[PDB]
Amino acid sequence: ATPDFPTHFPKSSIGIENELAGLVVAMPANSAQKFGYVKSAQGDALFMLTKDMNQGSYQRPPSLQDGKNYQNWQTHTVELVSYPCEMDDKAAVETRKQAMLWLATHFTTHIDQSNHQPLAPIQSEDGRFVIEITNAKHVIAAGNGISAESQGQTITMTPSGQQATVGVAAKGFGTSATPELRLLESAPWYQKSLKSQFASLTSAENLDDKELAANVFAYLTSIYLKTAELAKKFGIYINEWDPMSEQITPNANGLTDPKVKNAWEILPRTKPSKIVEILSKSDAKAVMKHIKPQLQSRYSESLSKNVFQYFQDGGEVAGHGINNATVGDKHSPELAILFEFRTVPNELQSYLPKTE
Numbered sequence: 271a272t273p274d275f276p277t278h279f280p281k282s283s284i285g286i287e288n289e290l291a292g293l294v295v296a297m298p299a300n301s302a303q304k305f306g307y308v309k310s311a312q313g314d315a316l317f318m319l320t321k322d323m324n325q326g327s328y329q330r331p332p333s334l335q336d337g338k339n340y341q342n343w344q345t346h347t348v349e350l351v352s353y354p355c356e357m358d359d360k361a362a363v364e365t366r367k368q369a370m371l372w373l374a375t376h377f378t379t380h381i382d383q384s385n386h387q388p389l390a391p392i393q394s395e396d397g398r399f400v401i402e403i404t405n406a407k408h409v410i411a412a413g414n415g416i417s418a419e420s421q422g423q424t425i426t427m428t429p430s431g432q433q434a435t436v437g438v439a440a441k442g443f444g445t446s447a448t449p450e451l452r453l454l455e456s457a458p459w460y461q462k463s464l465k466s467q468f469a470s471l472t473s474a475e476n477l478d479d480k481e482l483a484a485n486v487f488a489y490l491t492s493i494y495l496k497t498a499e500l501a502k503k504f505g506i507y508i509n510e511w512d513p514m515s516e517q518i519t520p521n522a523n524g525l526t527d528p529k530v531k532n533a534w535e536i537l538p539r540t541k542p543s544k545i546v547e548i549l550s551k552s553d554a555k556a557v558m559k560h561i562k563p564q565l566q567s568r569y570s571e572s573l574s575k576n577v578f579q580y581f582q583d584g585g586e587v588a589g590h591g592i593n594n595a596t597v598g599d600k601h602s603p604e605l606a607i608l609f610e611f612r613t614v615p616n617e618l619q620s621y622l623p624k625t626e
């Protein structure tokens with residue numbers, strides 16, 4: 271079994287996604303995403319071997335007929351998904367990058383002499399890396415896996431197949447205290463002006479933590495307003511809001527549509543309703559009460575009510591979120607909020623492995 275991602279980190283954390291070029295993985299239909307992992311010889315889990323984009327049904331090349339059942343098998347692109355590490359842990363960042371590059375060289379040899387065969391659980395020649403196979407019911411095939419023989423491909427990685435996910439303490443969003451927080455606050459959907467706006471709206475209120483409440487308000491309001499902007503732009507069905515009722519033609523399959531996720535640029539990966547937990551019951555009520563008018567002064571009553579209710583009931587920004595991540599003291603853990611960089615910016619390029 272592939273180990274689950276560690277959930278706790280002392281400070282800011284980073285995870286990477288690396289979609290490979292030059293090969294496919296074929297597995298039975300409805301198989302688990304994870305088929306293995308790469309760890310250091312010391313035992314530290316570095317990255318998962320996963321199936322990503324469905325490339326169509328698998329057809330075993332006739333010249334490689336082996337008496338085995340490949341019925342209903344599907345071909346997918348391979349994506350190397352790192353196990354998160356501390357952002358300032360130079361060794362852990364580099365080991366992940368080096369392990370990913372080694373596996374690409376291993377994959378290059380695999381498609382040359384073992385085309386249409388599963389990966390074997392092996393140790394690297396230098397002893398640094400170990401492959402663990404959790405699902406042996408898979409095959410690795412060159413290119414798109416139609417031909418029995420390869421085109422002598424070198425397995426590569428490129429910025430277009432790359433993503434990064436940054437995890438920060440939820441209390442820090444809006445503080446601009448660290449370079450990571452400043453980078454996340456630069457998100458085009460984040461409106462820092464909403465912090466001072468909340469302070470102006472709550473002068474007569476005796477709040478437990480005024481600065482924290484303003485930070486949570488700005489964060490949540492920015493997400494709620496962007497969701498309403500995207501629902502209007504892309505014609506998305508949110509809760510009971512019908513885009514067609516406002517003469518909007520749908521041009522996206524929902525909140526999880528790649529182009530909707532790309533429109534965020536810095537995509538929130540944590541359930542918005544989780545942040546309410548970092549505040550007192552009183553402060554959370556004060557924050558939540560002030561969000562509705564921000565939506566209603568910019569969007570229709572139906573869109574405003576539907577966006578507000580969706581996130582209030584624990585609605586996700588773009589599908590299943592990473593909601594169990596924590597930061598700080600191991601014994602008294604604080605909520606961590608995650609963000610996916612749809613395109614890796616210049617500030618995070620050093621965390622990504624490069625073939626060239």
Ligand SMILES: Nc1ncnc2c1ncn2[C@@H]1O[C@H](COP(=O)(O)OP(=O)(O)O)[C@@H](O)[C@H]1O
Pocket residue numbers: 275276277278283284285286287351352353354355434435436437592595596608
């Ligand atoms: N605690 C965490 N801190 C930072 N990054 C994390 C954390 N947990 C998971 N990640 C990263 O989030 C990403 C999730 O990968 P994945 O499961 O394939 O998600 P998805 O299907 O939404 O693309 C990985 O790159 C992983 O390293």
Ligand SMILES: [Mn+2]
Pocket residue numbers: 287349351
């Ligand atoms: Mn992924």
Ligand SMILES: [Mn+2]
Pocket residue numbers: 287433610
């Ligand atoms: Mn992703």
